[PDB]
Amino acid sequence: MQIFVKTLTGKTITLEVESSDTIDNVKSKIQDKEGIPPDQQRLIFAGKQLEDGRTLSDYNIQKESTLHLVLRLRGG
Amino acid sequence: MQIFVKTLTGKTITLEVESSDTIDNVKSKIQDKEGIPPDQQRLIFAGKQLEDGRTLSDYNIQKESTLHLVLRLRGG
Amino acid sequence: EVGYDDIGGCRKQMAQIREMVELPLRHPQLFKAIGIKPPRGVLMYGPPGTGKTLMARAVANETGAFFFLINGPEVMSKMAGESESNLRKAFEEAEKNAPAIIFIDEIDSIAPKRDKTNGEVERRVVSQLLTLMDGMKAR
Amino acid sequence: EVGYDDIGGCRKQMAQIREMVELPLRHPQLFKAIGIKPPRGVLMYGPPGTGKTLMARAVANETGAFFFLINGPEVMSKMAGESESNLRKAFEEAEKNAPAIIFIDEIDSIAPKRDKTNGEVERRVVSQLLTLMDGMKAR
Amino acid sequence: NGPEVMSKMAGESESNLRKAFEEAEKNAPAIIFIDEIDSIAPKRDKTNGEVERRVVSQLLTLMDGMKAR
Amino acid sequence: IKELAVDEELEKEDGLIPRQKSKLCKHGDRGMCEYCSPLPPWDKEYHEKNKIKHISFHSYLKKLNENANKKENGSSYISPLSEPDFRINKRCHNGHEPWPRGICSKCQPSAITLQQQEFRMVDHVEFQKSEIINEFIQAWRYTGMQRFGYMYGSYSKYDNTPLGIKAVVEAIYEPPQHDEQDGLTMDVEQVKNEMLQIDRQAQEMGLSRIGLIFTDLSDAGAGDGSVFCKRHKDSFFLSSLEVIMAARHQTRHPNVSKYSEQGFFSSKFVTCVISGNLEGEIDISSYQVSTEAEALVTADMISGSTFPSMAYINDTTDERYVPEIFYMKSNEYGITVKENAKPAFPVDYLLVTLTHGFPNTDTETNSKFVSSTGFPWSNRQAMGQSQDYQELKKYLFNVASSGDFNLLHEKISNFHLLLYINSLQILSPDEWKLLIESAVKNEWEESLLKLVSSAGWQTLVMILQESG
Numbered sequence: 001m002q003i004f005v006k007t008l009t010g011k012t013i014t015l016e017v018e019s020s021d022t023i024d025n026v027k028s029k030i031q032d033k034e035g036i037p038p039d040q041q042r043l044i045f046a047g048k049q050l051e052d053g054r055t056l057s058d059y060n061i062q063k064e065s066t067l068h069l070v071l072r073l074r075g076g
Numbered sequence: 077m078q079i080f081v082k083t084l085t086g087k088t089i090t091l092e093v094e095s096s097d098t099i100d101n102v103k104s105k106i107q108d109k110e111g112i113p114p115d116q117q118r119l120i121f122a123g124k125q126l127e128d129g130r131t132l133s134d135y136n137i138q139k140e141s142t143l144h145l146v147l148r149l150r151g152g
Numbered sequence: 153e154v155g156y157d158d159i160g161g162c163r164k165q166m167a168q169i170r171e172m173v174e175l176p177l178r179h180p181q182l183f184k185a186i187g188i189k190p191p192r193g194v195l196m197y198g199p200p201g202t203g204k205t206l207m208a209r210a211v212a213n214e215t216g217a218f219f220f221l222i223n224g225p226e227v228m229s230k231m232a233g234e235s236e237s238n239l240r241k242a243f244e245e246a247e248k249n250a251p252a253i254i255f256i257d258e259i260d261s262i263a264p265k266r267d268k269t270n271g272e273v274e275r276r277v278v279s280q281l282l283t284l285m286d287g288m289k290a291r
Numbered sequence: 292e293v294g295y296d297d298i299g300g301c302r303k304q305m306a307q308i309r310e311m312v313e314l315p316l317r318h319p320q321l322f323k324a325i326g327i328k329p330p331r332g333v334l335m336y337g338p339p340g341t342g343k344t345l346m347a348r349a350v351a352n353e354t355g356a357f358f359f360l361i362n363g364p365e366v367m368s369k370m371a372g373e374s375e376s377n378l379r380k381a382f383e384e385a386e387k388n389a390p391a392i393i394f395i396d397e398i399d400s401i402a403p404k405r406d407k408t409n410g411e412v413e414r415r416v417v418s419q420l421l422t423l424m425d426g427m428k429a430r
Numbered sequence: 431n432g433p434e435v436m437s438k439m440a441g442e443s444e445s446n447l448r449k450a451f452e453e454a455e456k457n458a459p460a461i462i463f464i465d466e467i468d469s470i471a472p473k474r475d476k477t478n479g480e481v482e483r484r485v486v487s488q489l490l491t492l493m494d495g496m497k498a499r
Numbered sequence: 500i501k502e503l504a505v506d507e508e509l510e511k512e513d514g515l516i517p518r519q520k521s522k523l524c525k526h527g528d529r530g531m532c533e534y535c536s537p538l539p540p541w542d543k544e545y546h547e548k549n550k551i552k553h554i555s556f557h558s559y560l561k562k563l564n565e566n567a568n569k570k571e572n573g574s575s576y577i578s579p580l581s582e583p584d585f586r587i588n589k590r591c592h593n594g595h596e597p598w599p600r601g602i603c604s605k606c607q608p609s610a611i612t613l614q615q616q617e618f619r620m621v622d623h624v625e626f627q628k629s630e631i632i633n634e635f636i637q638a639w640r641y642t643g644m645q646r647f648g649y650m651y652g653s654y655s656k657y658d659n660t661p662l663g664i665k666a667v668v669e670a671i672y673e674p675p676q677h678d679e680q681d682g683l684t685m686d687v688e689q690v691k692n693e694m695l696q697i698d699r700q701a702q703e704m705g706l707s708r709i710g711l712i713f714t715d716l717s718d719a720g721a722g723d724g725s726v727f728c729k730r731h732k733d734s735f736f737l738s739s740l741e742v743i744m745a746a747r748h749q750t751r752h753p754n755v756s757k758y759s760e761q762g763f764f765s766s767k768f769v770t771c772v773i774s775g776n777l778e779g780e781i782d783i784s785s786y787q788v789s790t791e792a793e794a795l796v797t798a799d800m801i802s803g804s805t806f807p808s809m810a811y812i813n814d815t816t817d818e819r820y821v822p823e824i825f826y827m828k829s830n831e832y833g834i835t836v837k838e839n840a841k842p843a844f845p846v847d848y849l850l851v852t853l854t855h856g857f858p859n860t861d862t863e864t865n866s867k868f869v870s871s872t873g874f875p876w877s878n879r880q881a882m883g884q885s886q887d888y889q890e891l892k893k894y895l896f897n898v899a900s901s902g903d904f905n906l907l908h909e910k911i912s913n914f915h916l917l918l919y920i921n922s923l924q925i926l927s928p929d930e931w932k933l934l935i936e937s938a939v940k941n942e943w944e945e946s947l948l949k950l951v952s953s954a955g956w957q958t959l960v961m962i963l964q965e966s967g
């Protein structure tokens with residue numbers, strides 16, 4: 001289904017996910033086209049930090065729903 | 077060889093600088109085109125302020141990269 | 153407001169004066185294919201108390217035209233020739249709205265015959281009114 | 292505007308004025324070669340309703356000219372003394388795009404005699420006209 | 431007053447008469463008393479040269495109206 | 500057509516000035532002859548008695564209504580309140596149908612007498628807080644160069660001036676500009692594209708761009724003296740280059756009026772400048788431009804001169820016919836009548852003054868925008884206060900990770916903080932419109948709890964805590 005993956009810098013990129021798929025397929029999709037390892041791939045929905053070992057049925061992710069991605073930036 | 081210095085008003089200034097010179101010569105070249113003294117001038121390279129005593133190689137500034145120009149007096 | 157039935161006794165002069173106001177405004181096509189130009193000035197004169205200003209207001213409200221009023225002793229200035237600028241001001245304001253009708257009562261008070269004065273500003277007041285009415289090419 | 296051959300009866304005065312103001316305007320030659328400067332002023336007079344304002348607009352239209360029009364009572368009706376600047380800009384803007392015709396209509400409402408003077412602004416515009424008329428000797 | 435409002439320079443007299451009828455309409459019932467109207471309204475004679483206008487004609491156009499009970 | 504809510508209230512009130520009985524009155528107690536009659540609000544004799552130098556245009560509208568509407572019939576409703584035109588009508592209603600060949604006196608623009616305007620649109624500009632414009636001067640104290648801004652505010656009544664409108668300002672927005680020590684000049688294209696989106700958020704908040712400010716200080720020695728004195732009586736009041744920027748801003752923002760034939764007349768726009776007093780401080784002053792002559796000739800004929808007091812008049816090229824400009828000045832012996840047959844005529848004559856001021860701190864009706872006035876502004880890239888989301892952890896943070904609603908709502912009413920949030924457009928536009936209306940209006944306690952219970956505000960504090 002169609003979703004709106006939006007990072008912290010306002011860049012929204014359209015991705016694809018199944019309604020019963022896990023969130024690790026989304027984390028693997030960010031690892032493909034953005035090259036981010038999963039220690040910095042932080043998705044947030046409904047004010048809660050989405051764990052990497054869960055599915056979309058717990059957070060009730062529906063079609064055409066936006067996503068809030070946080071990327072870690074550090075000097076050390 | 078080529079470089080691009082851009083102000084805050086959306087105006088990019090073309091300049092041809094050597095790859096192995098100092099930053100003070102870059103401030104002298106933008107002085108001759110407009111008439112701004114290089115004491116209050118400052119150069120921002122992607123959020124990093126360029127020091128006038130250094131060169132173009134230690135900051136790893138590549139060809140025709142977008143630069144920033146800002147004016148800030150020391151006493152003022 | 154008054155109307156056409158508001159005054160009687162001058163029924164012959166009422167039907168005569170109604171031709172020169174309705175035909176240039178209601179049906180102007182009679183002046184086409186006949187060559188001539190419709191006239192502008194109508195001159196009424198008589199003793200006071202006969203209803204000159206009553207007949208002027210009756211023909212204005214019965215047609216719905218842009219009525220205007222120019223008074224005799226009002227617009228007569230001595231400052232810098234302001235009467236010559238206020239006469240042409242009233243003509244261009246009547247020209248901006250179509251159809252329109254102006255009314256100048258006690259016209260003998262504004263620039264009379266020069267048998268007495270002959271040297272005042274009223275000699276140049278009437279000559280302003282000559283070129284203003286003759287320059288009315290707006291049919 | 293009106294044409295050129297729309298005036299009858301005045302054929303003798305037409306041939307007097309066609310060689311006067313139309314022929315030296317379109318032809319800068321045949322006056323320098325003959326050694327005679329052309330006249331820079333004509334005066335038309337007579338009874339009213341004879342073709343004074345009609346013949347001037349007819350002779351200036353179908354010849355090729357600038358035709359600076361200026362009316363009599365419209366000047367001097369200004370405040371704070373700017374009728375001289377409206378006269379100085381009248382003659383200056385005409386010679387910038389020569390050939391030009393300056394038709395002063397109703398000049399009797401501008402220049403009366405010195406025994407019928409009125410105020411102080413009437414003397415100021417008759418001496419401005421007499422000074423500026425002499426400035427056109429540069430051909 | 432007659433010889434008071436007519437001694438002005440022909441510009442404030444027409445506004446004083448406009449202020450006279452407007453204030454009397456605001457606080458009706460009202461009377462308007464004027465005196466020495468011959469100094470305001472003289473006759474037209476052979477000795478022309480006075481102002482004789484712009485004030486009495488203002489009184490003509492002010493008085494013929496205002497009769498709406 | 501519909502005018503403003505402030506403009507219709509000044510029209511309905513007559514604004515008459517009452518007087519008392521006197522020794523000169525000969526009438527009875529139940530009357531008035533001339534000396535205790537009600538005074539008109541447009542008489543300039545009462546104005547200069549109380550040192551009011553202009554006649555409060557809504558009363559000037561009343562003094563022309565007496566000339567338009569009379570006791571006679573009329574039947575016109577002309578209401579001659581229009582902009583006097585100096586352009587040339589091409590059709591001309593005569594035989595000189597082209598202007599290349601022919602021009603007469605009824606279409607020729609008359610010689611400009613240079614008479615001063617006796618009425619001003621805005622009568623008194625007022626401010627909201629001394630801490631608001633203190634941040635504007637603080638921008639000069641960090642970079643040492645001049646600044647620029649636009650003032651957003653509203654209007655209300657003014658009881659000091661008879662039938663007068665006062666100008667209230669609420670917040671100041673700064674466009675991105677290129678600063679310089681001598682002056683300043685920015686691109687008009689990027690400013691107009693930036694000002695289009697600020698006018699969107701100003702509609703729901705009840706704001707309107709009605710003013711602008713630009714600085715001119717020239718510090719003397721940075722010790723005992725504050726600034727130099729550039730603008731005084733012998734020098735220029737407003738430079739001729741800034742007259743052009745003030746003239747284009749008034750033509751872009753017209754004021755709606757039913758009395759005008761075109762539908763718009765008498766623009767209510769203020770131009771304020773920070774220049775300093777004569778002796779020792781940085782006191783500001785404001786003047787606005789004149790509508791009668793300067794507002795229309797700026798479309799064709801205003802050209803820059805080397806003098807700051809005067810402006811050059813250029814020449815005519817086949818469509819741009821201009822009349823002669825005259826003014827009176829004293830010669831070496833006496834005072835003479837109009838002399839100007841020479842270019843570079845002064846522009847300080849075409850300015851009408853205003854009275855600026857700040858209200859008392861003990862009481863007011865409201866202030867509506869005093870949150871901190873210390874938040875980093877949107878386009879202050881010359882200064883260091885142009886931060887990213889690192890500032891939002893420092894500024895508000897939902898204070899101490901658990902905030903009281905009396906201390907949380909007092910920070911949320913900032914103008915530039917609310918204009919920074921909606922640019923990210925995390926919240927819905929319906930929830931954002933009730934967010935800004937809660938911060939700017941009263942009885943906000945029932946609607947602030949609606950904001951914290953929404954999932955959009957929960958996602959805002961969750962995406963801020965993980966980021967730096």
Ligand SMILES: Nc1ncnc2c1ncn2[C@@H]1O[C@H](COP(=O)(O)OP(=O)(O)OP(=O)(O)O)[C@@H](O)[C@H]1O
Pocket residue numbers: 158159160161162199200201202203204205206207257258
């Ligand atoms: N049909 C009518 N014919 C004549 N008189 C009339 C008629 N109807 C009414 N009247 C009366 O005659 C008077 C009209 O006179 P009017 O007001 O025209 O004075 P006027 O001197 O003719 O005006 P002006 O000052 O313009 O010359 C009214 O007061 C009215 O009572």
Ligand SMILES: Nc1ncnc2c1ncn2[C@@H]1O[C@H](COP(=O)(O)OP(=O)(O)OP(=O)(O)O)[C@@H](O)[C@H]1O
Pocket residue numbers: 297298299300301338339340341342343344345346397
């Ligand atoms: N050949 C002609 N002579 C006189 N009048 C004419 C002639 N042909 C036409 N007319 C009529 O006379 C009018 C023109 O008269 P004109 O405007 O010259 O008045 P004038 O008294 O001669 O001069 P002024 O306009 O200064 O009074 C036109 O409206 C036209 O109908």
Ligand SMILES: [Zn+2]
Pocket residue numbers: 524525526530531532533534535536
């Ligand atoms: Zn009294």
Ligand SMILES: [Zn+2]
Pocket residue numbers: 590591592593602603604605606607
């Ligand atoms: Zn014209």
